[PDB]
Design a protein around this ligand. Structure first.
Ligand SMILES: Cc1cc2nc3c(=O)[nH]c(=O)nc-3n(C[C@H](O)[C@H](O)[C@H](O)COP(=O)(O)O)c2cc1C
Length: 379
């Protein structure tokens, strides 16, 4: 009798329930940023979530900023993702690839030919960044030329082509948490004077140019987008977030997208934060007429409330799904939740990744069987 467990129709995609695996960077790609059988197992284990949004996946080496995240810009990478989508689909799951460009949240040691990370404007984020040779201060990034934006937009279009060939049901545009697109959206990071800076509609321009390009590949009802309307993560700031996101969301609503994915302000990227704000999903339900996914800090009870009060249509869980591959079944049965271990969120191997237990061992067996079958299919 939990609305969390009610099947949901996503414009032809028959989701098993109203719960979503939030996108989660795990830094466990194989060589050349290629997904592995072990990654296929991880997603196959979590196929019981109604919808699985993959970890952020860079559209280019220029768009990477952390070790061993997977890409979607080479055929080798596509072939690795094929194991993932095959195993998820053999378990009757649904999976969207999250397309990524870290913008200024990178280091030249990740970049082709030691180039600086690129950004709307040359403003470094505060603090330090993990590199192949340890922690380092951020560099001032290079501000993109006007004629380079169309080239980054085209990288998204090519990424969407590769996502479709890899067998993803859809794609999610990462426009949150301080990365390239979010940097363009906020006037604290966007100081451009050309047609991508200045007015609210110029700073949003790159998001709409990305959406136009990827909707030449997928139908718009298979394209989602993720926003963080009020976060300080990675040095973000903007002088009028209400007017920024109300506009952006109202314009997103007329685009007939798969969904809008909003992060609650009580999350600062990957951690909980003490924070008062009125730019939460309650505020954006009015302005968006499509499918609305709410994310960040939810438990069973608080997620159920959002659905019951119709403040959202779907609820995304991140850290709990890291630790509970069968989170819907645990909610349904009022079962204890495995605690999540932050120490193994990032990097490493099966430990803290595929070795969290199920309520039903046949669930683990079936995920292993499909991961192994998927590897044999796409050897
Ligand atoms: C370890 C970790 C990795 C994450 N990676 C991503 C990511 O790749 N893309 C993204 O949009 N959000 C990412 N997030 C943010 C989550 O999607 C989610 O918004 C956040 O964990 C809060 O939701 P929760 O309380 O259900 O965990 C990550 C969060 C964590 C903790």
């Amino acid at each position: 009798m939990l609305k969390l467990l009610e099947p949901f129709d996503l414009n032809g995609l028959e989701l098993a329930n109203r719960m979503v695996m939030a996108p989660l960077t795990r830094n466990r790609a194989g060589p050349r940023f290629v997904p592995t059988k072990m990654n296929a197992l991880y997603y196959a284990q979590r196929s019981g979530l109604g919808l699985i949004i993959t970890e952020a996946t860079q559209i280019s080496q220029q768009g990477m900023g952390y070790p061993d995240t997977p890409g979607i810009y080479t055929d080798e990478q596509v072939d690795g993702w094929r194991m993932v989508t095959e195993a998820v689909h053999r378990r009757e799951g649904c999976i969207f690839l999250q397309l990524w460009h870290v913008g200024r949240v990178s280091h030249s040691s990740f970049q082709p030919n030691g180039q600086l990370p690129v950004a709307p404007s040359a403003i470094a984020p505060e603090g330090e960044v993990m590199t192949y040779d340890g922690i380092k201060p951020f560099e001032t990034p290079r501000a993109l030329e006007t004629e380079e934006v169309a080239h980054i937009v085209e990288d998204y279009r090519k990424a969407a082509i590769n996502a479709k060939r890899a067998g993803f049901d859809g794609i999610e545009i990462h426009s949150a948490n301080g990365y390239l697109l979010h940097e363009f959206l906020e006037d604290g990071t966007n100081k451009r004077t050309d047609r991508y800076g200045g007015s609210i509609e110029n700073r949003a321009r790159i998001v709409f140019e990305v959406l136009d390009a990827v909707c030449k590949v997928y139908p718009s009802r298979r394209v989602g987008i993720r926003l963080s309307p009020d976060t300080e993560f990675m040095s973000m700031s903007d002088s009028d977030r209400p007017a920024l996101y109300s506009y952006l969301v109202q314009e997103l609503s007329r685009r007939e997208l798969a969904y809008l994915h909003l992060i609650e302000p009580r999350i600062k990227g990957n951690v909980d934060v003490e924070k008062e704000s009125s730019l939460n999903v309650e505020f954006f339900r009015p302005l968006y007429k499509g499918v609305l996914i709410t994310a960040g800090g939810y438990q069973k009870e608080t997620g159920e409330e959002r659905l019951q009060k119709q403040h959202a249509d779907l609820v995304a869980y991140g850290r709990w799904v890291i630790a509970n591959p069968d989170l819907p079944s645990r909610f349904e049965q009022n079962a204890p939740l495995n605690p999540y271990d932050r120490a193994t969120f990032y990097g490493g191997n099966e430990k803290g990744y595929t070795d969290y237990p199920f309520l039903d061992p046949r669930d683990s067996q079936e995920a292993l069987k499909e991961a192994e079958a998927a590897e044999r299919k796409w050897r």
